[PDB]
């Protein structure tokens, strides 16, 4: 459990997840100056989604409160003019105090992941869930995913990682992928991650 | 039926439906330009969703290939330099062959509609009317004003029905994309209803 005074790079239309390590293409101006304070500092840095992804320009009031908090690892310039940055998320933040600045600039709280006592019906959700994903895998028809993505989805026992790794990969909505994310307690969160994998194999299975 | 040469509008996480007058918001420098070249001309427009909203500077390949044909009518400067358009749906059109050019630019044609086995989509139409009424009612997320639904409840022409239904409910891009993509009525109006009913499913479940 930390606090941290960070910049904040919004994101149109994704959600990031902890424990997920991906590459972020950054256009614009305020994201980009949010990046390099990260670079010339301690490159730390709040992702937080837009409500909205056609907002172009987003104020506190167009972002939702939770994000993750994340490591800056690289930058990298296409041949356009937008910055790829690869990101390590860590872990769940709420991101409530905007700072006034030249861009997106916000402290926020940075949360443990708490285990629960009944430990019994989490391991019975863990094989749940990695049985509900290879099918959603298998049944699914605009995926994109790697062997090796596939391989540790299936290697993962601890079940936030799993909960939270599974709903990075499928192709849910911001609202919903930014559920899980709000969903603090595991349990809730990792019958959450089934429910929806559920009705998406359900909805497979009719055609 | 008619294939006609017009700058394209592309939209970031929207898909417009004929039957439709939307306010758009064009921040985009190229956006902006094919807008004014419609107001100096016939202020006709072709508007078409991108396929990832992500993207900044879409190609053709970034785009759907079915958009619709608008008229421009009214543009907004707002103060932060972006441009609130006005723009009125009126048909679908495939939009094929992108243009060399600043902007994007392409010729597209332009269908009409025309009811096919007047049972089965009479049927689909009180189907629709009653599932799109408990579907407002069970949403929890919606917003639709009284004039709008007393408008669906009165409509009884099926393409109106279906395309004002899809405006109204918050399905994604590609789900509307497909409504917009099915010119064959009694598939669409099937279609529409098999969203409504997955939906209604849904929402009882909680």
Same mark, same amino acid.
């Given at each position: 459990?930390? #606090?941290?005074?960070?910049?904040?790079? %919004?994101?149109?239309?994704?959600?990031?997840? =902890?424990?997920? &390590? &991906? %590459?972020?293409?950054?256009? #614009?101006?305020? $994201?980009? #100056?949010?990046?390099? !304070?990260?670079?010339?500092?301690?490159?730390?840095?709040?992702?937080?989604?837009?409500?909205?992804?056609?907002?172009?320009?987003?104020? =506190?009031?167009?972002?939702?409160?939770?994000?993750?908090?994340?490591?800056?690892?690289?930058?990298?310039?296409?041949?356009? *003019?937008?910055?790829?940055?690869?990101?390590?998320?860590?872990?769940?933040?709420?991101?409530?105090?905007?700072? =006034? *600045? %030249?861009?997106?600039?916000?402290?926020?709280?940075?949360? $443990?992941?708490?285990?629960?006592?009944?430990?019994?019906?989490?391991?019975?959700?863990?094989?749940?869930?990695?049985?509900?994903? !290879?099918?959603?895998?298998?049944?699914?028809? $605009?995926?994109?995913?790697? #062997?090796?993505?596939? !391989?540790?989805?299936? *290697?993962?026992?601890? =079940?936030?990682?799993?909960?939270?790794?599974?709903?990075?990969?499928?192709?849910?909505?911001?609202?919903?992928?930014?559920?899980?994310?709000?969903?603090?307690?595991?349990?809730?969160?990792?019958?959450?991650?089934? *429910?929806?994998? $559920?009705?998406?194999?359900?909805?497979?299975?009719?055609?």
């Amino acid at each position: 459990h930390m #606090r941290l005074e960070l910049p904040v790079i %919004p994101l149109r239309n994704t959600v990031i997840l =902890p424990h997920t &390590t &991906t %590459p972020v293409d950054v256009g #614009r101006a305020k $994201s980009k #100056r949010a990046v390099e !304070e990260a670079m010339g500092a301690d490159r730390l840095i709040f992702l937080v989604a837009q409500r909205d992804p056609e907002v172009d320009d987003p104020a =506190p009031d167009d972002l939702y409160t939770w994000g993750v908090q994340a490591v800056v690892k690289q930058a990298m310039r296409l041949p356009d *003019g937008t910055l790829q940055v690869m990101v390590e998320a860590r872990a769940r933040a709420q991101v409530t105090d905007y700072i =006034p *600045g %030249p861009y997106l600039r916000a402290r926020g709280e940075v949360f $443990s992941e708490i285990f629960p006592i009944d430990e019994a019906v989490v391991r019975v959700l863990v094989e749940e869930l990695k049985e509900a994903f !290879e099918k959603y895998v298998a049944n699914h028809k $605009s995926l994109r995913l790697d #062997r090796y993505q596939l !391989e540790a989805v299936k *290697g993962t026992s601890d =079940p936030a990682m799993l909960a939270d790794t599974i709903a990075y990969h499928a192709t849910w909505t911001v609202a919903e992928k930014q559920e899980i994310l709000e969903l603090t307690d595991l349990e809730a969160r990792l019958k959450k991650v089934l *429910g929806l994998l $559920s009705r998406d194999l359900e909805r497979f299975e009719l055609d």
